[PDB]
Amino acid sequence: MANRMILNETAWFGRGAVGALTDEVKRRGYQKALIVTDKTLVQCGVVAKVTDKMDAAGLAWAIYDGVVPNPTITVVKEGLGVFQNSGADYLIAIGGGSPQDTCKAIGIISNNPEFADVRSLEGLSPTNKPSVPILAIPTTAGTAAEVTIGYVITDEEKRRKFVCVDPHDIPQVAFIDADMMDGMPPALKAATGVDALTHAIEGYITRGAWALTDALHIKAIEIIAGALRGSVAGDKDAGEEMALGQYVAGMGFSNVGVGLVHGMAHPLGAFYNTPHGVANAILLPHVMRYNADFTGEKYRDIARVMGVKVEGMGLEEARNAAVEAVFALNRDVGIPPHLRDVGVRKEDIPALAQAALDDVCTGGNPREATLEDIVELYHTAWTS
Amino acid sequence: ANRMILNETAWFGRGAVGALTDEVKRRGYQKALIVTDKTLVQCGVVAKVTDKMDAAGLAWAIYDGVVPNPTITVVKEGLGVFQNSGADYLIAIGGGSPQDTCKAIGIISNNPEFADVRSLEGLSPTNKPSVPILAIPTTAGTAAEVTIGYVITDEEKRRKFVCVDPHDIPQVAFIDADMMDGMPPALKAATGVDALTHAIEGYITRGAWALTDALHIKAIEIIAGALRGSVAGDKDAGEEMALGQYVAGMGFSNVGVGLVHGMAHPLGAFYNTPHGVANAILLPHVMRYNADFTGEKYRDIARVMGVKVEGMGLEEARNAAVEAVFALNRDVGIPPHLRDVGVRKEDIPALAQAALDDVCTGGNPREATLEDIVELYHTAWTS
Ligand SMILES: Nc1ncnc2c1ncn2[C@@H]1O[C@H](COP(=O)(O)OP(=O)(O)OC[C@H]2O[C@@H](O)[C@H](O)[C@@H]2O)[C@@H](O)[C@H]1O
Ligand SMILES: Nc1ncnc2c1ncn2[C@@H]1O[C@H](COP(=O)(O)OP(=O)(O)OC[C@H]2O[C@@H](O)[C@H](O)[C@@H]2O)[C@@H](O)[C@H]1O
Ligand SMILES: COc1ccc(CC(N)=O)cc1OC
Ligand SMILES: COc1ccc(CC(N)=O)cc1OC
Ligand SMILES: [Fe+3]
Ligand SMILES: [Fe+3]
């Protein structure tokens, strides 16, 4: 009956926020960092924005940049290997979900060595010790990996993404700095932006929802719906709004759950390596329609903060307005409307529906999802 | 760039103290010193926690010497008990007074150079985190469980001083209306308007930004909605108040308050006035004073406080916001004038000077002069 909230003890918000990291490291007396990132962020000079400030304050660092989209067991093991031979006593996550989730796995397994197979971390990880201290710097807007107690690792052998949930993995400090995010191509702003929206909407209507998370989620929907078109077009101010809104969504959904969008999205990541945000975006409006009659008054709120005039609308009419508002936003930021558009195969749907039913996220969905329900949703989402 | 310090872990709702035994075992702590006051031992509130700790086999000693507006003496005495207790962590059970006493003890224990206590004033230059604190509020009230601030009374200099330190943040908060139900109506009323003050002052403070604005406006809405119900003794309203007071804490701790708290602290020092009653009497008068320096923010306050602001000009809505606060104060049975609770006309000059010097006053959106604070005390005083 009582509800738990895990949050960052310390976080810095706004352009220039990464400038606070050298001070926070010195006040905690940490000796050497392993920075967990990917190739693109080294090559575009984003990592250098941090390693330059660390050089100027005389703080030692090694780099692991082997992280691929939808990080694998292989990538976790390889990164853990580098951390142990680096002599580091803390971690700095620089990137979107992929590096930040890779970083959490490494930080957990280092101080809980019985999980070295990594796949045994799935579900409520029964870890005894806190993670290696993590300092988190997101470069997408965003997975909110910096504030959530969750991370998603791809099992190549079993061809599935598995969710690990553990209060021990919470970063010590987050640095939410739109300066780190500006380099996102439009399509990445669009995808990660609707991933943030999905978190906010799924979180708002999830079974575990209560007053505090409702307050956070509805605020994040308002910020994201307001700013995402601006940000994809390349507006400085909208990009900062998105940086905050994606985080506020994290503060909610981490603590209560999401639903069938994330459940149906994870198999698409496993099977095709589909960007998490694109899969969520295509699925979100179809799953909202499916969930509609099981969400009380909450679609009125979604539609209103998304710019629709809901006064004088009936409950069912407002529920349609909320779904149409999400279709419209997807059209406007250039996310295709059908799963076949991103190479999902008609024949896989049975195996996809089964993976979706078994995914941790699906138990939070407000309408109780059957195998045949998920099959029909994939089909409706696949073509017209 | 703006910083947010929050609880890493907190539990919300009736029964939330049921999670403590689990949280202590997962952190491997051996023995607690519970910091509380006599009333909370006598009303069986402390026993609700020590019973659950007995059943899980977790050791505890108790310090119950905390008085309202905790003193340097009380901090020193409590620190003495903690060192001779063999405890390795702290459990705060009470409102601001025990929770603030507990933070001082936890800080000074691991930063022994502050044993005089009064050297903690301002941004405490502490090197080491506090002794781990687990916080259980029994008032709907100070948000001591989530803020990086604590207020200690200096008897010798006759002033309350604010200590601000990220090292004092509790590890876990337990926000449990079950622990709060035993508040007499007048205590629910006072601590409830202290929460409102935090929310309103925090909303309009100089350091305010989007995230704290979002928290504060939600807390104003919850408190304005629930406080009448809670004081009358409604179970559900008491839980709403328990959440709303906390959400206010998540904001103001990180950005600041203003001239209400600045003017309230001297009234605590001079007369031992309950913090919530002083804030309540002052709040509407300081809002009127601040009105012309708060942009559009009083529209928002008035709207979430149940006023229809759509047809209203800016100045008309600013008045509606102030009248909404007067009405709520009247309704929960708070005396409406400072003279009613024994504030003396002759002290106002010394009161105004203490207010000008208080840390809280630098956050106020309108820059306050000595003469301004003098005039505010006078207008707040009249029978
Ligand atoms: N600022 C940036 N500028 C340009 N490219 C960037 C930037 N930040 C990241 N990228 C690139 O975007 C691509 C996607 O990066 P991810 O980290 O995979 O993206 P994100 O959506 O943040 O994370 C998805 C991952 O997180 C999990 O929640 C989810 O299930 C999935 O595993 C990569 O090529 C990465 O290098
Ligand atoms: N649940 C309760 N049931 C009964 N009595 C209670 C309860 N909670 C508190 N009390 C009693 O109410 C009185 C006031 O307690 P405080 O802790 O002083 O109340 P609060 O308003 O929470 O604390 C204010 C303090 O915090 C600082 O911010 C402020 O400067 C001031 O020192 C005391 O006698 C205390 O025992
Ligand atoms: C169960 O809640 C979660 C579901 C999915 C994720 C990964 C993500 N960012 O989408 C994290 C979670 O938090 C515990
Ligand atoms: C300067 O900020 C503060 C002003 C007042 C207090 C005490 C209170 N809660 O009434 C705490 C503060 O810091 C968190
Ligand atoms: Fe996601
Ligand atoms: Fe206060």
Residue numbers in the entry:
A (entry chain BBB): 2 to 385
B (entry chain AAA): 3 to 385
Give the exact sentences the study uses for this entry.
This enzyme, referred to as FucO, is also known as an Fe2+, NAD+-dependent group-III alcohol de­hydrogenase and is involved in the catabolism of rare sugars in E. coli.
The mode of binding of NADH in the active site, including the nicotinamide moiety, is well defined by the electron density map, being the same in both structures. The mode of binding of the substrate analog is the same in both structures and well defined by the electron density map. The observed mode of binding of compound 7 is possible because of the N151G and L259V amino acid changes of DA1472.
